[PDB]
Design a binder for this molecule. Structure first.
Ligand SMILES: O=C1CN[C@H]2CCCC[C@H]2N1
Ligand SMILES: O=C1CN[C@H]2CCCC[C@H]2N1
Length: 330
């Protein structure tokens, strides 16, 4: 089997991407944030505290003839940005772009933190990291990809995110019309449960390529590119007036600037992020200070190749017995 679904930016800055997902019988379609940095599929639901729902579409398990309470199971997750959610668990039929899994754990939120309530465009998350990170207790549950894997034509999914435009998540096949050149594959460590790999270096604008190993994760659920402070300083030094602002929480730059590109290495290959992809717009409405798309990972504990980096490439998440990642230009 295969599946193919379009993913759509939630706003004009590409702050996140949402993909429609069918849950239950008859189908209830919710728009989920596909997140290769976590492993829980959770949704706003009829069980979510009413004051914490503001415009999201909810899953109602009592209206699904295929829903079954997973008795005794609970879940609770906290993300790197301080947001969180928790609840109980149903199994139900879940379909993405024509690919159907029966018996998928659908984690129903009883509580969500303020940042989730305040984002009416995101109805929940669909985790695509390794199932070892799934938070369901006492019986850990598998991700949608893990459940689908054996049925897929090939044990892979691909992320093809757009810049200021929709893109595609495919399951079970590699669309050879969706990229240019060849796909360069690179080793993955699953020891932390992430799609963790090592970039071979970077360049700023037209500058010379610096060969240096940069360990990090491919995380579709993170908006920006988070890299070591040395690398990030070298980038922003090329932008007149750019500076790190403690009050804003990262590098800002004059909105009048033209940003340089940033290149990262994948083995001997190179992925070029155009400068415009690094512009996240005014820090507040009407400001002439703009927020940068490349930020330091120093306070995080891991480097994160988020959407800023991934959207410059066609990315293969190869879930074979030894997982690997593939990157192509497009
Ligand atoms: O609550 C948790 C459980 N352990 C991890 C799961 C994936 C997201 C990061 C972290 N947060
Ligand atoms: O596990 C993850 C990857 N996806 C994102 C969700 C929102 C907060 C940042 C990040 N945490």
């Amino acid at each position: 089997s295969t599946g193919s679904a379009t993913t759509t930016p939630i706003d004009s800055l590409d702050d996140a991407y949402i993909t429609p997902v069918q849950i239950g019988t008859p189908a209830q379609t919710l728009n989920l944030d596909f997140d290769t940095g976590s492993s829980d599929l959770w949704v706003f639901s009829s069980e979510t505290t009413a004051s914490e729902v503001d415009g999201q579409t909810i899953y109602t398990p009592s209206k699904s003839t295929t829903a079954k309470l997973l008795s005794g199971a609970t879940w609770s997750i906290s993300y790197g940005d301080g947001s969180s959610s928790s609840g109980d668990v149903y199994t139900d039929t879940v379909s993405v772009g024509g690919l159907t899994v029966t018996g998928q754990a659908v984690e129903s939120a009883k509580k969500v933190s303020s940042s989730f309530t305040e984002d009416s465009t995101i109805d929940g998350l669909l985790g695509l990291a390794f199932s070892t990170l799934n938070t369901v207790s006492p019986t850990q549950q598998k991700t949608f990809f893990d459940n689908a894997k054996a049925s897929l034509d090939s044990p892979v999914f691909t992320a093809d995110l757009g810049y200021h435009a929709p893109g595609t998540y495919n399951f079970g096949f590699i669309d050879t019309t969706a990229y240019t050149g060849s796909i360069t594959y690179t080793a993955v460590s699953t020891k932390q449960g992430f799609w963790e790999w090592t970039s071979t270096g970077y360049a700023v604008g037209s500058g010379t390529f610096k060969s240096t190993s940069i360990d990090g994760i491919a995380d579709t659920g993170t908006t920006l590119l988070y890299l070591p402070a040395t690398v990030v300083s070298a980038y922003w030094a090329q932008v007149s007036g750019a500076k790190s602002s403690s009050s804003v929480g990262g590098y800002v730059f004059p909105c009048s600037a033209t940003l340089p590109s940033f290149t990262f290495g994948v083995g001997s290959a190179r992925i070029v992020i155009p400068g415009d992809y690094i512009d996240f717009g005014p820090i507040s409405t009407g400001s002439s200070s703009c927020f940068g798309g490349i930020q330091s990972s120093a306070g995080i504990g891991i480097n994160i190749f988020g959407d800023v980096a991934l959207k410059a490439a066609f990315v293969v998440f190869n879930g074979a017995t030894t997982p690997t990642l593939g990157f192509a230009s497009k």
